[PDB]
Design a protein around this ligand. Sequence first.
Ligand SMILES: N[C@@H](CCC(=O)O)C(=O)O
Ligand SMILES: N[C@@H](CCC(=O)O)C(=O)O
Ligand SMILES: N[C@@H](CCC(=O)O)C(=O)O
Ligand SMILES: N[C@@H](CCC(=O)O)C(=O)O
Ligand SMILES: [Cl-]
Ligand SMILES: [Cl-]
Ligand SMILES: [Cl-]
Ligand SMILES: [Cl-]
Ligand SMILES: [Zn+2]
Ligand SMILES: [Zn+2]
Ligand SMILES: [Zn+2]
Ligand SMILES: [Zn+2]
Ligand SMILES: [Zn+2]
Ligand SMILES: [Zn+2]
Ligand SMILES: [Zn+2]
Ligand SMILES: [Zn+2]
Ligand SMILES: [Zn+2]
Ligand SMILES: [Zn+2]
Lengths: 252, 252, 250, 250
Amino acid sequence: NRSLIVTTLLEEPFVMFRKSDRTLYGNDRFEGYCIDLLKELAHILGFSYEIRLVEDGKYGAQDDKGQWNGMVKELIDHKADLAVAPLTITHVREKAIDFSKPFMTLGVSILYRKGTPIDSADDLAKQTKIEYGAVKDGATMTFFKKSKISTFEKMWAFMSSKPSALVKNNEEGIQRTLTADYALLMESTTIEYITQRNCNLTQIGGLIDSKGYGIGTPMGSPYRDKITIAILQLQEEDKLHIMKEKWWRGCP
Amino acid sequence: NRSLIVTTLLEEPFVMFRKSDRTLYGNDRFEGYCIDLLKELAHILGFSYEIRLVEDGKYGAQDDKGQWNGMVKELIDHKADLAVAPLTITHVREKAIDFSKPFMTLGVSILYRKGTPIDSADDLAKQTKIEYGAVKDGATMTFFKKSKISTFEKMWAFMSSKPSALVKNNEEGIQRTLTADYALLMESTTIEYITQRNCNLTQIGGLIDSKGYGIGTPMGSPYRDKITIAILQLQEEDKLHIMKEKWWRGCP
Amino acid sequence: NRSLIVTTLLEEPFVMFRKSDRTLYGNDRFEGYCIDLLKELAHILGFSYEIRLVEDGKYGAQDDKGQWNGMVKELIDHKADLAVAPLTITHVREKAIDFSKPFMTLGVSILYRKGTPIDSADDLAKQTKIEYGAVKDGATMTFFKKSKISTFEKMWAFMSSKPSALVKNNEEGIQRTLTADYALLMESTTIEYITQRNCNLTQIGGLIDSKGYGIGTPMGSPYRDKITIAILQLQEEDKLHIMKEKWWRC
Amino acid sequence: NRSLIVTTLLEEPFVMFRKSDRTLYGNDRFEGYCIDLLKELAHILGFSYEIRLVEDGKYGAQDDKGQWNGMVKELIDHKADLAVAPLTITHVREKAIDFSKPFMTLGVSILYRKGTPIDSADDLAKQTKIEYGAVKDGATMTFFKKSKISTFEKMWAFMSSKPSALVKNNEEGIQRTLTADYALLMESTTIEYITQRNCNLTQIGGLIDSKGYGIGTPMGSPYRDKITIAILQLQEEDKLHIMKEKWWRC
Ligand SMILES: N[C@@H](CCC(=O)O)C(=O)O
Ligand SMILES: N[C@@H](CCC(=O)O)C(=O)O
Ligand SMILES: N[C@@H](CCC(=O)O)C(=O)O
Ligand SMILES: N[C@@H](CCC(=O)O)C(=O)O
Ligand SMILES: [Cl-]
Ligand SMILES: [Cl-]
Ligand SMILES: [Cl-]
Ligand SMILES: [Cl-]
Ligand SMILES: [Zn+2]
Ligand SMILES: [Zn+2]
Ligand SMILES: [Zn+2]
Ligand SMILES: [Zn+2]
Ligand SMILES: [Zn+2]
Ligand SMILES: [Zn+2]
Ligand SMILES: [Zn+2]
Ligand SMILES: [Zn+2]
Ligand SMILES: [Zn+2]
Ligand SMILES: [Zn+2]
């Protein structure tokens, strides 16, 4: 019996500020893959909504007291009804919030410049010349912090130690990659987006793991299963694959 | 304890003759999405194989005696061990052969020229000026022949009646579309391929149904589940999505 | 937290009494396509259940006062949590109860003896020699009773006319097509089951419409969406195809 | 076409006797993570089964003659169709039996009293005051017994040395860490279960390796691939996560 508060953050090409001469307001400020997804979901399920950028600009992770930040935290405190973004479904987050079925698959990989001898995460772990990190308080950082795998523990030790290696967001990580001897642990669909538009960057190795993006809701929300049903409809209508190709579609 | 006989047929961009000055022989004659898929499957499961084009150049359908032709028939008579092509999984075919899990999703739609008033299958059914058909002895023809839906029965009546409307293959159907007032009932991933490379053709309407392509095997084959497991691995490694974009990737 | 009450009714091959040499009781009494479907749903959703045949043996329809009966009424009154049966999804019903996405598609058609000239609802309406009808207070009845089309408004006149035309259930109607000069307006997947067993019967014409069967729940049910997801998962794994082949296979 | 024989053994929280006020029998005797997993597999693949505890209570290892015992031996000799248990996937085992893809990941680690300075296998090997060992004829034993690494070739000397060091099962080993100055080399998901119940115990150090548990079948089994597909489907639906939370939750 109302509109929903949709939380999200700026991340190319998922959610971006549209270009317009005249000043746009409210939901009209945004375009991108997730904005389109949101429009399709609101249409099918018949709900109205308002988009708010999350204040601390973070996806979400736990401190030592066990308290969350980022979009995940917004759902916990019922300040939002849906998180509509490239929000990684993880078993850690499932303890605190709920996720629809995935609308896109991805895995962690490495973004780095072309031409080097580096071919895998192990090659980065072995050495210390080349620095490497991940986005701060995102799922990738959490993957390394929580890993029990010898190599990844080693890499978390390194990351965590260097005072600069954990970057505010993807844009800052991309800039560190371009500007310094730095490799970014990054999700593969974004690496795909970046490497199509920057011929001097490449993906290093394959996927370190495998997961998906899903719409987040507060735990117990009835919209979770409704959103899952709408996502399944769109996959059946092949609308998600058309949507990807529109926002993702050359390097010699 | 041997190599496998892989049956298939020429269909762009799934299976094609490679371009080379020097004459190529055997499996070296072919390239395309399915050729790549086959290489990845043989690698994972560790089997060797030989590719043979199916004689009558057909996918497969039943006559009145209930006898099959095309690739489906090759599997029935154990003349091949795997059908590796854009082979549509249908409940009709499952009675005679087995399929792996799908490696690609698709649905039936319409290919026709841009600019017209035609917007759906119903618009074609209503009238008779514009002729329309499907590939002969493929899953699309069978979909219309077997349909109990009023509109599709109407369209099958029309198709079936016109002596020319059922075309030998996609290439001939595409040519009829370009050359005459003709709309082709065609699977959506191929329509996608064609409309990216011919700016005067477009998809008409959405998908009429929803299904997938799978690797075919003779009924009871142990390779069926092994191929399913290998397909799942490739999806996990995100190799199928990379493979699609390589063979499918502009129109103002 | 408790066992869900499932309402249903006897209808081959969806729900039937299992054969035995002793008196069976509880859920153990039943088998069939819809029983197998219920078992999948209970496993996937993780619930226990008790099957209860609907007292009045009706699918469900409204009277002039607008009150419901049959399984539909059981859901409305919260006497049952789910209806698991070949329950037709219709707009009128969607106003009083919720349905899952369909687990089977079908349409109205005609069951009749082999070997006559009658070939469509057309042929039957043009004439009054061969009698005809449908199950009382079912979706097929309601379809004719609400149709604006002329050929069917025609037939509803006939059915609303004769005192006998509307049979109590499919069994009585199949009996009548074997006993008297009578054609039964019946849903096509059931026609399919019957004509494969009774070689002296056949379907007449095509499908008069297109619709589906769904699992019924009372409005506001915390289970309907989960049940839709379960049905979508069954369909994806070809389980509904296999389930139909199990129970449908002249 | 017949009921599959499932071999397993008692190990909390994977397989345990259910509590009751009467004597239970058959499959009804058991509960736990692996029992729930078996039920999912039986439902998905559509088979009936009979659970039989392995006579010698061993997971399985080779002797000098190269002959096997435990559940592994039961599969080799075709006395059982499946092994459903926390059965570690190892190369040596992969030579004699087939495994599904893993349903759980784990690694070797150390269980010990809280409050001491010992902090890794390192610390334990450097010293001989605190005694240590592992389950006899299990995968952890075989890991130390085959290791070329020095710190572990070290410890296998110690374990192959003392007559007591190798315990009969996890229960005896946990008892011993509570009873005597003894550290148990044990698999990490089991350490996790225990330390959440016994607040005076803790894990020492990290994971010495990485591997997984899988369903065991005899070589050439017509069920192994189907079982892998079923496990992949469970994992996709987060069912294995939910199953672990059910049985693992100081
Ligand atoms: N999509 C990630 C953020 C990016 C990353 O962590 O690599 C998340 O939901 O936390
Ligand atoms: N892929 C189809 C052929 C093309 C079509 O029928 O549209 C088949 O397997 O039969
Ligand atoms: N399946 C119908 C009953 C049979 C019929 O009306 O033909 C219903 O749900 O009402
Ligand atoms: N899970 C082990 C037994 C326990 C251990 O060796 O620590 C096996 O399969 O042999
Ligand atoms: Cl019995
Ligand atoms: Cl009853
Ligand atoms: Cl009891
Ligand atoms: Cl026993
Ligand atoms: Zn989970
Ligand atoms: Zn595409
Ligand atoms: Zn099927
Ligand atoms: Zn892509
Ligand atoms: Zn099932
Ligand atoms: Zn109630
Ligand atoms: Zn209305
Ligand atoms: Zn299950
Ligand atoms: Zn045997
Ligand atoms: Zn070896």
